[PDB]
Amino acid sequence: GSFLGFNTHFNRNGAWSPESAVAFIADSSRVKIGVRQDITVKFLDQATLGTG
């Protein structure tokens, strides 16, 4: 088992681009994701979608 000393994460949602990268190695303290609003669902029943 080769990758000791990394926290390893595997992309499984089909976002990976295998023609561009084999792997990214990063300092995780220096990457931040701002979550202004996490995924919210609204049920629509009266609304209109599209035009013409």
Partner: protein
């Protein structure tokens, strides 16, 4: 072309409304038949 679908554009709106009526009591007085209860001062539109 002016259509805003609020839910599809992630918008909301307020609708504000009121219902009003007006009546002027033009009526007979002790002076006679068709008397108006309001007068007006109109602006000076004549140059010196």
């Amino acid at each position: 072309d002016n259509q805003i679908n609020l839910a599809e554009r992630d918008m909301v709106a307020l609708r504000l409304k009121a219902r009003f009526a007006y009546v002027l009591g033009v009526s007979a007085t002790a002076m006679g038949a068709n008397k108006t209860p309001v007068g007006v001062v109109t602006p000076d539109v004549t140059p010196p």
